[PDB]
Design a protein around this ligand. Structure first.
Ligand SMILES: [Zn+2]
Lengths: 331, 206
């Protein structure tokens, strides 16, 4: 690695990953926390070109090398051979989009940076699979059923300690990028307390209970759905315009006002804060990823009309403090 | 005014070191990462541990800081370490107390004043949720020692009766009562100095 004596810092940044990290620092302009993180890992996922890796290939990779001892220490040699074989297979399938040496170096260096800050060349294989499957591009329900099955025993049961390990391994990623404090920091215990309060202090937690628990935007996990949501709104074209920068049409997200008529703003105009004189941005908004339908438009019209007669500032939120869960679209 | 001069000096120092840009949440996260939060406040630490904690805090602050304005991480870290050494160890012993470091971090961290007051009250509060009068006196003494480094110690000297001027010794200190005392117009010396420092920082920033 690299040693900086003047700052006394140990760095494992790949030069390509160094360029990626500089780009992330430049794109830090988003004032919002988890939206900025979602954009950042989207940049990283597109950069290391694993989005074209399928989930079934991930199952084949994990079950091919017989890696089922979750507590077994992992050495550099085994992971490099497995990862090289996987990217060689990907190049066999994606010859025009896969560079095996660069890809394996990027993946190994990424994992080394995130999970092995202790400079030991060893990391729990459970953390490895959780990270590589969180970065993996796939659907949603399959992801949760897979990681629950991975953590649960043959009976499909997961105790408090297991979910604590998963919580820690999950928050490891925001810790790498120095924004874990927004999701509550390294303290995973409050998440366990909330999950047990939901489950009325049940002795054990099953798959369906965990599904229902996370389907209500848990504070520490917001970076899983939002990420996918961003992945669902990178090629969406709306039939509208941005009232600030005169974009036509909006590509990507769409944001609609509620206490105004014929007001819409693009994603960049929203995160950056192009403050046009006359109207502020501290009012309730509505977020749209997919192109809208007529029913949604008329319902928004009705909501605006109803709000027009519910004035006098019943509820106000001037500071940001974290305004991530704007509104649910229910796909 | 001497209090006004001290508040202006503190605001200028915070602006130069960007201390107001670091929230207390980053501070507690760094302390948990360094395991100093679980450590006893009476346990001292070497200069290496404090330097590592400051460097980690600066690194996590800058990682989310846009490249639009590059920050001299090394120079800022050196200045912060020198200021902490001057405020906590005038004799240059090289050892920094955990309680003094925590109090200084809470004071210098920017964010909502109510949140900082609640955090300070929770830290002062014992396992039963009641603040300790001895803890309040120790905090006042540490604050007075810190104000001496800004060449304004006479206006904020170490007085044991100052806590008696804030709240009654025979009356329990609650979060609501502490917030009311701190936010009141006739605030005590420490509460007035905190509001004065906040006003000076707000004026300097805007
Ligand atoms: Zn726009």
């Amino acid at each position: 690695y690299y040693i900086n004596h003047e700052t006394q810092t140990t760095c494992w940044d790949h030069p390509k990953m160094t360029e990626l990290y500089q780009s992330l620092a430049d794109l830090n302009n988003v004032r919002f926390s988890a939206y900025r993180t979602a954009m950042k890992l989207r940049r990283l996922q597109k950069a290391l070109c694993l989005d074209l890796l399928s989930l079934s290939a991930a199952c084949d990779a994990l079950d091919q090398h017989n890696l089922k001892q979750n507590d077994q220490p992992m050495d550099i040699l085994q992971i490099i051979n497995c990862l090289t074989t996987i990217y060689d297979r990907l190049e066999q399938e994606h010859n025009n989009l896969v560079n095996v040496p660069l890809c394996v170096d990027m993946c190994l260096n990424w994992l080394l940076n995130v999970y092995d800050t202790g400079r030991t060349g060893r990391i729990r294989v459970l953390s490895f699979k959780t990270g590589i499957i969180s970065l993996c591009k796939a659907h949603l329900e399959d992801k949760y059923r897979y990681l629950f099955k991975q953590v649960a025993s043959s009976t499909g049961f997961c105790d408090q300690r297991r979910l604590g390990l998963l919580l820690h391994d999950s928050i490891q990623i925001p810790r790498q990028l120095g924004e874990v404090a927004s999701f509550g920091g390294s303290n995973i215990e409050p998440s366990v307390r909330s999950c047990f309060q939901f489950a009325n202090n049940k002795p054990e937690i099953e798959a369906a209970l965990f599904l229902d628990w996370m389907r209500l935007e848990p504070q520490s996990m917001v970076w899983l759905p939002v990420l996918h949501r961003v992945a669902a709104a990178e090629t969406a074209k709306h039939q509208a315009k941005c009232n600030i920068c005169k974009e036509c049409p909006i590509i990507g997200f769409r944001y609609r006002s509620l206490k105004h008529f014929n007001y819409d703003i693009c994603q960049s105009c929203f995160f950056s804060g192009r403050v046009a004189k006359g109207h502020k941005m501290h009012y309730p908004m509505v977020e749209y990823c997919t192109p809208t339908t007529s029913g949604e438009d008329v319902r928004d019209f009705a909501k605006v009309l109803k709000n027009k007669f519910r004035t006098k500032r019943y509820f106000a939120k001037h500071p940001r403090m974290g305004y991530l869960p704007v509104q649910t679209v229910l796909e | 005014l001497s209090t006004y001069r001290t508040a202006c000096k503190l605001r200028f120092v915070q602006k130069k070191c960007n201390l107001h840009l670091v929230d207390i949440w980053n501070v507690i996260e760094a302390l948990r990462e360094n395991a100093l939060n679980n450590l006893d406040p009476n346990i001292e630490l070497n200069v290496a541990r404090l330097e590592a904690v400051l460097s980690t805090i600066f690194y996590q602050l800058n990682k989310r800081m846009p490249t639009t304005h590059q920050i001299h991480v090394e120079q800022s870290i050196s200045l912060l370490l020198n200021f902490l050494l001057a405020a906590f160890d005038p004799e240059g012993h090289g050892k920094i107390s955990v309680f003094a470091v925590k109090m200084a971090l809470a004071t210098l961290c920017g964010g909502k004043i109510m949140d900082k007051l609640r955090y300070i009250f929770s830290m002062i509060s014992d396992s039963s949720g009641v603040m300790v009068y001895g803890r309040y006196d120790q905090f006042l003494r540490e604050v007075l020692k810190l104000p001496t480094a800004v060449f304004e110690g006479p206006s904020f000297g170490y007085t044991e009766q100052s806590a008696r001027s804030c709240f009654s010794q025979q009356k329990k200190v609650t979060l609501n009562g502490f917030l009311d005392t701190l936010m009141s117009d006739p605030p005590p010396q420490c509460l007035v100095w905190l509001p004065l420092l906040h006003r000076l920082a707000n004026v300097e920033n805007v």
